[PDB]
Symmetry: C3
Subunit: 304 residues, 3 copies
Amino acid sequence: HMFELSDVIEGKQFDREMLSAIFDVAREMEKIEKSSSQSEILKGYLMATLFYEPSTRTRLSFESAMKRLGGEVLTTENARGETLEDTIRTVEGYSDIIVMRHFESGAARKAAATANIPVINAGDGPGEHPTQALLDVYTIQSEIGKLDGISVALVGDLANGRTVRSLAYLLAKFKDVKIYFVSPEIVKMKDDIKDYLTSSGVEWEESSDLMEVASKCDVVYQTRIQRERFGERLDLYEAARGKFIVDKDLLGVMQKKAIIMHPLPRLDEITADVDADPRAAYFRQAKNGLFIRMALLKLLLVGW
Amino acid sequence: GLEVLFQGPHMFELSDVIEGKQFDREMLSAIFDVAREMEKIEKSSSQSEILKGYLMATLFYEPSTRTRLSFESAMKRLGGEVLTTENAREGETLEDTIRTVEGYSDIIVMRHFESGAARKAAATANIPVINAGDGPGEHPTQALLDVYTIQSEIGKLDGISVALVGDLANGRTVRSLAYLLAKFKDVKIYFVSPEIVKMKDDIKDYLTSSGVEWEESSDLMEVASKCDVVYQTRIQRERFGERLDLYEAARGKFIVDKDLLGVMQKKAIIMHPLPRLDEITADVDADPRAAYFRQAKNGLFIRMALLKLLLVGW
Amino acid sequence: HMFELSDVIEGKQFDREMLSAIFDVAREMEKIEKSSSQSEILKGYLMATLFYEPSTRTRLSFESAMKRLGGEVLTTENAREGETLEDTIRTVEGYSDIIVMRHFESGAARKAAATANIPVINAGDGPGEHPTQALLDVYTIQSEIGKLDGISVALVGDLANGRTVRSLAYLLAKFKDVKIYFVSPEIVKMKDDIKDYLTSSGVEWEESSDLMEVASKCDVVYQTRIQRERFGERLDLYEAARGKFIVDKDLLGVMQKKAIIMHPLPRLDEITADVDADPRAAYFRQAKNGLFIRMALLKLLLVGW
């Protein structure tokens, strides 16, 4: 069979049935990485890596995905004049798949249209990051075992957080989900997501009491609250500070089967001695990105 | 492309790719012959291993994502591997850098911002060196893939008319191309430019010494109709200097657009070395005579053929 | 036989026997690089380069090493960008099988080695330990001279603050009947810790400012630069030093036939260009030897002896 998506660009390309299929493939890719013999699935295929905004973690995730499958890479750490449409039409002559990260929203769409070859969005500015939401939902399926009938908290900057929005969207494709929105009032989630969730059958609750929510949740997804979002209201920052941190006291209330997650990078919103608890899943999360992006590379080049 | 009476090695020597004069017709025939075989190899679906075991070192002091990936791809399409360095700018001098890097690799592809560095590396190294662009100096792989594209699209190089448009005084690309088209028979060259940036007398001389016919014109529209090839390059506004009156007059008169394509022959082609801003309109892209992206992909086949000739021979 | 070391962080890890044993591995890696059939020893292994402080020379050394052995590389020339290195290393180790890192800040190689459950090689700890430089230096001496016991080595240049002369001196002392001339302006003479170490190590050392007299007594002349920065305000001591610590045609004229000139590079006018033509100029051979030492370390840490 051949893959049903010609590119990987945005979250709305995915439906529940697809996501389950992709995660099955990702567990095949995990069995490959752990093997001791070098796979040749993608032998002969080249990947161009175009990172107009550089993220070392995310690139090497992708490059490592290509080489763990037997492919090779035409790596470009910056790439930051000429049109993007010209850059893509030229690069596709030297490669078979393109993984781009831009500083401008809309860049992935332009490229996928221009390109005759698969294009994967590794970060379209302030816009969508689909591989990040895919690894986040696969990480939940993997840590908790189920995606139906789960409770997830989304903590931090929800108004302007691009990772929590893209994730909520994808979680909505499953049954019996409840989502908590733990944040200060000034960075609470925006109404297009809330309405999307009510429409999709998702029960949701707003709160400022992280301590109360973590005790009831199957998952705690942490994101930093930047000071910039508080602007002039520094009294609201003062109050907010220290109330939305994952620390040893927060793990006390959490259920033994719950987990802490994080898109990374993280500062002091998660403390170091959380890393000891097996429930801290943000590093297996990052590893899980290797497996998911292996599946996409595989499916986009040689189908199911 | 003709009929081979001898299947053994060629009589030329080729240990570095540094400057146009290197290339006689025999080397153009050899390089173009091999390039057409690499085209087969790239389109082929089984990974080649001609340059298995070889390591290319990629030193781009003047970063160019387009040129570098072309060379890196070419190497990896022939089964070689690449130690890449996108931005090699930082000073320890170049010869210390080359003599060290040559220990770590089998071939070096340098692109400098300063002229004469390609020649310094070629002499300092005891491995092959390819000039990916010597700053304001030679860019030979570009000139090679320009000529190879004309033959590829138009079928021939003898008896063609070629328009060179844009900054001809300071155009690094167009001068190299004119020098390499001069080596053929019955070629006519049109220098389409404003007076401020017309071609320098040292090129106009060489084309007269070597019998090539050339004509000047600031009326691109008239020339476009009489040509096999329109080779567009941008005119930077900085070249006019204080004469902003002359910039106003030139503005809009050297631009490839759908209007220009109308008056153009059906078998002629549009070429651009890239990058291109607004001197070629985006709606020209759809027309099959817009060969600037096929021109770029040609860079891959020509750069694979060079790697091959340099590391394994015939 | 697995490799006795789990990371290559500092010099104090090495003893006389480990060094000689590792050097033999390098002479094997020399035969592999000269071979025409591509090696596959490290096939299926991925190296992650992490150069916060860019060094095109040092990086390619390591990358070429991995690929000559059949491994592959996840390159990053400039890793400087605000998360913690510990967080960064843990993530990377998910994507790789060995991490080679160069940092600008002292103490980072220690951090990375402790965090990762895969091997780490220190390519430069900022101003701290640069162990694979000290290793390729000693191996180049053994290679050109033929032995490390009973040699005379002159360390020339900024001795007070130069980490390379100190790290080379550290490893050379592990051998028998060595002598070291500290050639340098008086204000940048070698610090007491190293002198006490050499004395306690059974090593003879002699301070001098006369590079011409020392040169004729030496098997090796290890040249480094003396940045004007090091004199601080004593530009009189910089003018007095100028011209007197240079390796030039005149100096080559007083040195033994089987002596050599070494330099870790980058080198400016402290070695003149007509010195490269002489066969005793070993600094470019020295750099090539880094390929072999670095192949040997990659190979040992990942599959062992």
